[PDB]
Amino acid sequence: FIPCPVDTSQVILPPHLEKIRDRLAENIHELWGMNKIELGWTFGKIRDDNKRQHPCLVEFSKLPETEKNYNLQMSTETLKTLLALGCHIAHVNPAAEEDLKKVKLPKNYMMSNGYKPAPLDLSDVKLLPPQEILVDKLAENAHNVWAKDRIKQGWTYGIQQDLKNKRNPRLVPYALLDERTKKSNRDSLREAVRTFVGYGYNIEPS
C-alpha cells in the first residue's frame, strides 16, 4: 500500500480564506473533545492511555502551537484540497454567520479546566447531492494523507496497534478499511463542508 493523494503541491491558499480555514480548525477540535469525552477521556498533565487522560483536552487557543498548528495545517490542506478538485469558495451569504448557533452539551462534559466543547449545531445543513460526492473524495484523501505521513515517519502495519512501535492496524488501502471508519471519516468532513455553508460560503466552481 502506497497512498497517492491529490497533488496540492501547486495550490496556494488565498488570504480571504484565512478566517474560514481558522474557523474550521476551531470546530474540528470541538468535535474532537466531544468525541473523546463520549469515549471517556479526561484532562491530565500528560496523556495517559491507561487513565484515558489527554493533555490537549483544553480550549483550542490554549493548545501548544506544536500540537495546535497541526489543526490549522491539517485544515489548511483541507481547503487547498477543495481548490484542487475544481471548486472555488466564495462568501456569498451574509446572514449565515449570525443564525449560526453552537450546541449546548450537558453539564457533565465540563472538566477540570472548566471547559465544555461547543460544536456547531449544523443539524439542518443538508448538503446537495453534488456536495456529497465531494465529501467521499476528501474522506478518502484524508486517509491517504494521514497514511502518507505515517510511512514517511516509518510506520508499518500490525495486527493491532503498538503505540511504541511503528505497527498500526489501519495502514491499509481504503478498500481494506472497515465501513465503520469509512463513514466515521466522512462523518467529520461532511460536518466540515457544512461549516463553509454555516458561515455563508459558496462551494461552487465557476
Ligand X SMILES: Nc1ncnc2c1ncn2[C@@H]1O[C@H](COP(=O)(O)OP(=O)(O)OP(=O)(O)O)[C@@H](O)[C@H]1O
**What single string gives the DSSP state of each residue in 107-131?**
GGG--TTS-----B--SS----HHH
39 or 159: whose CB is closer to ligand X? 39
Q: How far is Cα 182 from Cα 205, in angstroms, rounded to an integer?
A: 26
Cell 461547543 locates to 118
Q: Which of residues 134-173 bind ligand X (CB under 6 A)?
A: 161
CB of 139 to ligand X, least distance (A): 14
52 or 101: whose CB is closer to ligand X? 52
162 or 204: whose CB is closer to ligand X? 162
Total interface residues for ligand X by CB under 6 A: 3
Q: Calculate ∠ Cα 175-178-179, nearest 5°.
A: 95
Of these, 4, 39, 95, 159, which contacts ligand X (CB under 6 A)?
39
Pairing of strands 201-203, 89-91: antiparallel
17 or 138: whose CB is closer to ligand X? 138
Residue ranges in contact with ligand X by CB under 6 A:
39, 56, 161
